[PDB]
Symmetry: D2
């Protein structure tokens, strides 16, 4: 099948990539980075997020695999010593696919109310450029709170172990089709009030962030920034699209959580 | 239809109950507290939890309604001045029902490994009698962590605004069939380690709490305690049973959250 | 005595300032904004922080008073209706002064290791421009942790009810000569580790923040930014200087806390 | 000098104690557990807290030393392999003493308003027997908040790395004469409100806990419980007494914190 391999870029990852390419050359496997059906990421979770966005337009036709040349990653869940066994089992095929939910981010900007859309595998954040900013939080067209603070983070299930976790959010199993909103240093006194707790939204719920005064701020989607100015709204909802993983053995999410945060 | 009315017990609630009973006497409505199809709770959320457990054996044949004689409740979402309109709309019928997920708690105890089961509308907690206690946390038969601290709380979705919220847990919309585990003052140092973050589990996942040394502690289910000694395991899973609410108008969960924590 | 009055700038504050100036004209009080002995701030805590930095070079010769034209402030603890009584009691004199500790911030920058120093009444923060940044935390010349996250906040006692509070820090009575360091969304996994808890340092302890890779970031002191590039170190210590308040009646810190966060 | 040695009780600690006793027999050192001037604790922090309370009536005449037969402790900061060097340097003398602040707990109980007093090295806690309880919090005779939740914890500086830390409290250097109050799962909604943040009190401030309805609950002082019923008040204040440590080398508090929570 058509495949491609992304590399973190250091000597170790580039070398494993070349050895896997040589291994794939011994089967009916063609290297194609334009229309790959299999995308292998060799590096960390940052390398994997890069591969995801590199092919975010062909998500339904791609199964991702991550190899971690350093420590264990949440998306890179293969050890480099198993690369040959990966090439072998990947060559034959007949593997099962596993799908994780994604986050759709819509940004309304400009005088013409143009709308740009993005997909996030970890999270999308809206953050003040400097100091605190003010944003109205609207849930299914009802005004919920006026947030004053550093920013807000909307995470996917698999993203809950990332930025979301550092903000006090809950860890959610990726079989739950949902999104989680966490606060970044909210102001709470007699006059200003936020819910404080993380909020977990099901499918079809729409969370709208509407900045009040200043209209220029930082919007992130995973490891990058959404470059649009004069923003009037950031809408969040569980995407109808999913990322597909090629799985070859049982590595449960909670064991992955245990291995990455408890002890390995 | 057969109905019954529980009362908080003060003058205000007893009086509204008697007036509603008189109102129901003007329709084809029979008072029956043995096999009611409608259970009306007049009081707070504590009164509502009492009504739930009072009829936890006929949950699939009952639609609950809560009236709050004091402040707004999360389960008591009717104002006393609307009691007549409630009797009227309840008398005719044709209302829609809304179902919230529940939590199944199984307690393995004794030499014979007997198993008692309970249903929780808010949460079930395992807490040390005095000082900290030690419990092994097993998720789908894999050991996840050894918890050392004051206790653990497993909450339903509608329970996430209760004990769960005070422990730092996330607020989950009740359409999500899940349960959330939060820690109570865990010890974390070089030797002892817990995940710290709240954990959200989907259906069919089983969380097993297995106390290590001391085998006598406090188990709660909502507002009461499970009285069984020589405990060997407390198993948590999303129940296959649901609580059914009779709804007569739109009162969304997030507006209920806003009204109870932000401002009303 | 020589005095001056700063104004928030809206109609209400400018008007009270002009009326107080007219009131002071009836006593041996001279308006002098170059060498004032009394500085009156009419507005919010933001107006008061402006007045503090406007005269941060003559702190030992000035007693500050704050009037809040809106809600109660932590530094503006006079109501506008008491402005006449303030002018009267201020005119006579014989009032007691109250001193709060301050925070000294030293920034080492450039090839020549130049050092600029600043005083903070609330806090000084070091924050990443975009995404997370890495800083080594050195306490009294011993390496304590390598912080990876959004930033760090070092607060004075009176500042603990401000940014520090939103970051989970403790509220400290201003009679305690100390500073408190809080984290902003630290990364914590198997590889990366911070203390997590807020840290409270006594006098003469020096906390040094030494950025690891990127050397360009945002340094704040109260409501403004310290504009120096090529930073090599940010040193924190309790200042030997103090801010002096003119007090005319008992308004204890904890009652001020109660009035601003509990209920007023 | 007169000395005594407490032991955790396992084979390793009892054996080191007997070897140190034999070592002390070679100097002008007399074993006396009635009036010791030096108290050596061999075990963990639990063993050290036992030794502290065992001699809490002669604190001003005793210098404590802790040896940790297992992992490093915050009070047991000597390794067992250095026991001979400890006996040797302790035999000569001329060591410096280091003093940490303590917490005075006064319990008013009974019809006669009797008052029992206790000293805490780590903390004193007031906790509900079952479910949540209600206590009024009075600071210097002014009512600050009505706490509804699981309990409250008042910690010494050296205690801030213990129960206080697990409750979100700040870590305070023991040179700061203060006490810190942290909440245990407080209820916060539209009707019920607490400060939420930890509170740090200087010397001479008195925090009074006055239970509202139920008058029977659990009071702890370090590892034990204060057995008095019909309680009307629990008063907290920084004690005028201090615990004295015999120090033989520099082991700074922050390095001790780093070694116990970051990495060792
Ligand atoms: N504050 C905070 N906190 C927390 N978190 C966070 C923050 N911010 C941000 N964040 C994240 O991040 C991501 C991105 N990136 C890249 C870039 C950045 N970075 C760098 O720099 C490095 C160094 N550091 N420093 N300084 C990529 C990634 C990733 C991931 N993912 C995940 C999941 N899912 N789970 C779990 N884990 C995880 N991870 C991790 O994380 C870290 C960082 O990464 C590392 O380990 C990795 O493995 C965004 O997305 C957000 O989330
Ligand atoms: N710590 C903590 N925190 C938090 N929380 C908690 C705690 N513990 C417990 N808890 C809860 O609680 C419940 C039970 N109870 C009764 C009994 C007890 N109580 C009493 O006493 C009173 C007084 N107080 N004091 N002191 C009933 C109920 C309920 C409910 N539910 C809900 C939901 N769902 N959401 C929201 N909210 C809510 N609620 C609320 O809550 C509170 C208390 O209630 C009140 O307001 C009410 O409305 C158990 O279940 C747990 O959850
Ligand atoms: N995230 C976060 N959180 C928290 N916090 C914070 C933050 N960031 C920052 N911060 C603060 O701030 C300050 C400054 N500023 C001005 C500027 C900014 N601002 C604006 O925009 C407005 C709107 N908002 N929004 N969006 C001034 C001031 C002040 C103060 N001070 C105090 C004390 N001491 N205590 C208590 N409270 C207080 N305060 C308050 O606070 C708020 C804000 O202000 C208000 O209410 C006032 O009264 C810096 O310093 C930091 O601290
Ligand atoms: N929740 C929570 N959390 C936290 N914490 C706490 C709690 N509760 C309580 N606590 C503590 O504690 C103590 C007492 N104890 C004994 C008894 C109990 N115990 C047992 O069991 C064992 C097993 N476990 N489990 N389960 C003794 C001691 C101590 C101490 N001290 C200190 C300082 N200062 N710093 C730092 N660290 C420390 N420590 C530690 O801690 C842990 C526990 O110990 C161990 O590692 C030790 O080394 C009371 O006092 C309170 O604090």
């Amino acid at each position: 099948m058509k495949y491609m391999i992304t590399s973190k870029g250091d000597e170790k990852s580039d070398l494993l990539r070349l050895n896997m390419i040589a291994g794939f050359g011994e089967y009916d496997m063609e290297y194609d980075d334009v229309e790959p059906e299999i995308v292998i990421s060799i590096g960390g979770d940052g390398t994997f997020l890069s591969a995801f966005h590199q092919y975010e337009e062909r998500l339904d036709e791609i199964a991702f695999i991550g190899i971690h040349t350093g420590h264990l990653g949440f998306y890179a869940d293969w050890r480099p010593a198993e690369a040959d066994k990966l090439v072998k089992l990947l060559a034959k095929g007949e593997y099962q696919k596993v799908s994780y939910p994604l986050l759709k981010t819509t940004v309304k900007y400009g005088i013409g109310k143009k709308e740009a859309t993005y997909l996030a595998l970890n999270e999308s954040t809206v953050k003040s450029s400097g100091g605190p900013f003010v944003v109205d939080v609207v849930i299914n067209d009802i005004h919920f709170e006026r947030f004053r603070g550093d920013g807000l983070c909307m995470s996917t299930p698999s993203g809950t172990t990332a930025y979301n976790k550092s903000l006090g959010g809950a860890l959610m199993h990726p079989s739950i089709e949902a999104m989680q909103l966490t606060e970044m240093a909210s102001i709470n006194n007699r006059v200003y009030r936020t819910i404080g707790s993380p909020l977990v939204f099901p499918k079809h719920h729409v969370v709208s962030l509407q900045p009040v005064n200043d209209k220029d701020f930082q919007i992130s989607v995973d490891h990058l920034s959404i470059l649009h100015r004069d923003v009037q709204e950031i809408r969040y909802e569980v995407s109808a699209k999913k990322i597909h993983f090629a799985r070859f053995r049982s590595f449960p999410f909670w064991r992955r959580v245990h291995d990455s945060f408890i002890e390995d």
